[PDB]
Structure 1
Amino acid sequence: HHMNTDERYKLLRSVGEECIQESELRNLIEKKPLIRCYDGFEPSGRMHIAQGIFKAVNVNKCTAAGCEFVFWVADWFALMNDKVGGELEKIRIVGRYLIEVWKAAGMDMDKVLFLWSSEEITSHADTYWRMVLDIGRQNTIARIKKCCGTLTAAQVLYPLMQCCDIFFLKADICQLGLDQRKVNMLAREYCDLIGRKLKPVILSHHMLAGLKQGQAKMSKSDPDSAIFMEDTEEDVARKIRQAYCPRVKQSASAITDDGAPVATDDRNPVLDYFQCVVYARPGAAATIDGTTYATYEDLEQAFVSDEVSEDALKSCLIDEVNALLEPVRQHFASNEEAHELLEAVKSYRKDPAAPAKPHACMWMPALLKVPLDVAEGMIKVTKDFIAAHPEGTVTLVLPDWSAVASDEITGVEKDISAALQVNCALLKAYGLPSSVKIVTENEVILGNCDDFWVSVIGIARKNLLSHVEELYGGEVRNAGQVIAALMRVATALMLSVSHVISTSLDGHINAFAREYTKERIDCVQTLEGRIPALHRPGADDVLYLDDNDMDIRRKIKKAYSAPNEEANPVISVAQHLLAQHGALSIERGEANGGNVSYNTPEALVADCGSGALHPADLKAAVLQLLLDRSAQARALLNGELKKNMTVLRNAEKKMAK
């Protein structure tokens, strides 16, 4: 029997307690041959009747209605505890057992796939993890909290990973529990954020009610709240018998944004199992004392009218459920290979490094135009660090991932990579030591992708979301900033770092590294404020590395200075130049004062505030000194970095919007 297109729709729809866009569901049924349903799970190893029987009923309906059904096995998290214990292979077996309960429960596997997160993710780490960070980048942290006093660790990440899966697999339908609602809804919202008309339909299935009064769904910490598949028939009888069983008809449970089942005095888990585990089966009906009830409704009518006695209804269900489970018990009884997985599942129920030589770590500012004051700061800390530790090493990280996460500059990968390579090239030319190694985050991730993201979560699971919000000042811009912070600590540990250097632009972020390693990693702070903005105290009035010679002149012209001033910006810059060089000479025509070299900043002030060091002569000498000092750098603007600069002005254009 081939179902007509209306009957296919009806059958697939029946799966869902809600359907987000039935129109979308239809058009899928009407146009698309191998509609993708996906659903996912972390192998627990103790399978309840909803995972065994009910899922199978719904998988079968989807394959019937002409879907391919992909199971996403979230086994990736097993890698956390893998170096010790090797829990990946153990969780694969728990999974393999689950699939095998599924075969024997009657899942038609013809059109059903199983994918392993561990296998799949690590085969396209690039495409996956970049999307994870983008989903965070484009979303307000408040909105990622809704997918989960204030206890929240970095479980802000789990939703992003989940939301990624949806796109990674190319799911057309999300056929998961109603409680996964908000993550799935996030995916629909995300399509909009990437100009993508076709959206995933959310076909949320019912959450089975807990057996005892006041338990909206099954309880992990109460075995009698649900029927489990390894429950021998005496257990089934005992669990049902005591079950809550109101004499009330069972209307739909109006949906909360949360997806979260709510226990009520009206809901009857005996009647829920009868709807979900019995009648949901294509041809099945329940029989009590010689009468057979064709629909769930008929049985309900019976119970409430008082034709079927509570004891009898529960007797019916027990016979019914042992009937569904018996095939599955024999199979594990007789199929050795099956049995072994079980006894394996049973047995499982048995319950950093400091670098010898010092090494500093600095993060290049993800900025389009880098101030000279920040640049010089970086060069100084480097030179200071090396002098203090000549044996040691310094490393500059270009954050070509984390900076995309935080929505830095345009928040586009190509723009940000360009901004970094240019400004870093300029920084080396401006005087950053050769001895300093330059590495990109991409280089560090590829280097050890598996371990990197594992570390990221490991760290994540030991710290509160609120704390990462503190690190950023208490508010975060987007959920991507949260990922950036974690990544930093991760990079630090992989780079085997003893010191983290921090510019003015890093704020407190980098302390995380220190706190995490329990103060083993020391913090070093940049020394800035030696080159101020050029305008009068109280724009393009800041000197940046990428200033060409035409730019400098303009800025040093506009720069504020008046006569008889002991302090202003042009003096500050002058005072700065004088310290590094060791001196500062200025050419003057005799009768304007004559040529005169200052080897001490006091003297400079002395002459400026009271005396005939005219500002014009000071600026002339300062402007020329910046030019001499910036030569190599500006040669790269017009030369080797010419092409890469193009992207940057294109970026700037965008952002002016």
Structure 2
Amino acid sequence: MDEFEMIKRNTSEIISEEELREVLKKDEKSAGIGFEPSGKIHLGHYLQIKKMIDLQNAGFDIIIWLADLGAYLNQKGELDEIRKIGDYNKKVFEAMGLKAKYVYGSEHNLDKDYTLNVYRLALKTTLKRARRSMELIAREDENPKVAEVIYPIMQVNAIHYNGVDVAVGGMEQRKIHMLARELLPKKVVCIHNPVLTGLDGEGKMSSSKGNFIAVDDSPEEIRAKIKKAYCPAGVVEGNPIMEIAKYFLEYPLTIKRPEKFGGDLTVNSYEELESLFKNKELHPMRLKNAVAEELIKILEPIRKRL
């Protein structure tokens, strides 16, 4: 199906494709993703919002859950300062061309009936299971707090509370979402997107450890950031520059180079770019320059609307 192909494109996994095919037959359907409000919104966020846009075009009503209370339980600061960031994040997400219901957790996460359901789920969730679900999400702490195990069941309940057919997130959301499928009466279809590699080649991209491209970065910031990113010749796996070409660039694409080096390169797909680089037919710096300029031409509509 056309819709199914467009949804699956560039996903790490769908749990399950069979169930997703059933959701697509319905007349009304909805999908939700949530984010701990972040000071800088980077390509990691943009990749996921792109996936939410795909669902919108397939007839899904979209909810964005700004998990300000979740960020609080995960030691990201005080609530009023997280709300300020969440307002900015809502600004950015609309600039990406997503029109969705933007909901703040704290405005719904503390009502009488929501809280009781969290405690019902706490009866259903083992500590071991809750601990393991936060392995990739919990901010480091040498004395892990009780708030760390309340966080995942709150995320399970938002899925229940939102009534969505589809839950979207990064692969690090895998085990929390697997919990929601067991504990909630309705099984939710889970779409997980890949984790972007940081520009310095060490771990994922993230607001902390400045190894990211923000969607509102200036053309000068993007070039410099990409100029010095991790990118060994002939190396595709773990290469953040190739990931950006795979997930954000529009094809066909032209690499201009003098005839002394081969002449201009018309690249009709990402796979053709992968072949050129693997065969050392394209020097890393010419790769970086082209990707940076393309990215600038892709993030420009976002910059203007902000």
TM-score range, shorter chain: 0.7 to 0.9
Shift of 1:76: 3.1
Q: 1:286 to 1:105 in 2, by over 3 A?
A: farther
Aligned equivalents of 1:101, 1:220: Cα separation in 2: 15
Query: Could you say what secondary structure the match of 2:248 adopts?
Result: helix
Shift of 1:206: 1.1
Conserved 8 A contact 2:241-2:291: yes
Amino acid at match of 1:99: K
Tell me what 1:21 maps to.
16
Query: Could you say what secondary structure the match of 2:305 adopts?
Result: helix
1:10-409, aligned counterparts within 5 Å? 10-30=5-25, 32-51=26-45, 53-76=46-69, 87-88=79-80, 90-107=81-98, 109=99, 112-122=100-110, 125-148=111-134, 151-154=143-146, 155-191=148-184, 196=185, 198-213=186-201, 215-223=202-210, 225-248=211-234, 250=236, 266-279=237-250, 284-289=251-256, 290-332=264-306
Q: 1:183 to 1:78 in 2, by over 3 A?
A: closer
Shift of 1:298: 0.9
Shift of 1:328: 3.0
Amino acid at match of 2:173: Q
Aligned equivalents of 2:290, 2:28: Cα separation in 1: 39
Query: Could you say what secondary structure the match of 1:156 adopts?
Result: helix
Shift of 1:322: 1.4
Tell me what 2:259 maps to.
none
Shift of 1:324: 2.2
Q: 1:60 to 1:78 in 2, by over 3 A?
A: closer
Amino acid at match of 1:182: K
Q: Deviations over 1:410-434 (max 9, x none)?
A: xxxxxxxxxxxxxxxxxxxxxxxxx
Aligned equivalents of 1:15, 1:132: Cα separation in 2: 33
Conserved 8 A contact 1:43-1:75: yes
% identical equivalent positions: 30
Conserved 8 A contact 1:285-1:295: yes
Aligned equivalents of 1:286, 1:115: Cα separation in 2: 38
Conserved 8 A contact 1:208-1:276: no
Amino acid at match of 1:169: N
Shift of 1:229: 2.8
Q: Deviations over 1:247-306 (max 9, x none)?
A: 4465xxxxxxxxxxxxxxx41111011111225xxxx44321243322110111111223
Conserved 8 A contact 1:230-1:329: yes
Shift of 1:79: 8.2
Between structure 1 and structure 2, the one with the greater Rg is 1
Shift of 1:168: 0.8
Tell me what 1:582 maps to.
none
Q: Which residues of structure 2 form unaligned runs of 5+?
A: 135-140, 257-263
Shift of 1:238: 1.4
Q: Deviations over 1:6-31 (max 9, x none)?
A: 1111111225211111110111112x
Shift of 1:77: 5.5
Aligned equivalents of 1:320, 1:157: Cα separation in 2: 42
Aligned equivalents of 2:86, 2:153: Cα separation in 1: 23
Q: Deviations over 1:454-484 (max 9, x none)?
A: xxxxxxxxxxxxxxxxxxxxxxxxxxxxxxx
Query: Could you say what secondary structure the match of 1:287 adopts?
Result: strand
Conserved 8 A contact 2:41-2:207: no
Q: 1:295 to 1:147 in 2, by over 3 A?
A: same
Between the two structures, name the one with larger relative contact order (CA 8 Å, sep ≥ 6).
2
Shift of 1:152: 1.7
When normalised by structure 1's length, the TM-score is: 0.42
Query: Could you say what secondary structure the match of 2:31 adopts?
Result: strand
Q: Deviations over 1:579-598 (max 9, x none)?
A: xxxxxxxxxxxxxxxxxxxx
Aligned equivalents of 1:204, 1:86: Cα separation in 2: 29
Shift of 1:100: 2.1
Conserved 8 A contact 1:16-1:204: yes
Query: Could you say what secondary structure the match of 2:14 adopts?
Result: strand
Tell me what 2:260 maps to.
none
Conserved 8 A contact 1:249-1:304: yes
| Equivalenced residues, count | 289
Q: 1:118 to 1:190 in 2, by over 3 A?
A: same
Detail structure 1 runs of 4+ shifted over 4 Å in the superposition.
77-80
Amino acid at match of 2:279: S
Shift of 1:58: 1.2
Amino acid at match of 1:140: T
Conserved 8 A contact 2:29-2:59: yes
Conserved 8 A contact 2:67-2:104: yes
When normalised by structure 2's length, the TM-score is: 0.86
- Indicate the RMSD between aligned Cα atoms, in angstroms: 2.4
Amino acid at match of 1:47: I
Conserved 8 A contact 1:37-1:70: yes
1:557-636, aligned counterparts within 5 Å? none
Aligned equivalents of 2:79, 2:114: Cα separation in 1: 23
Aligned equivalents of 1:164, 1:145: Cα separation in 2: 17
Amino acid at match of 1:306: K
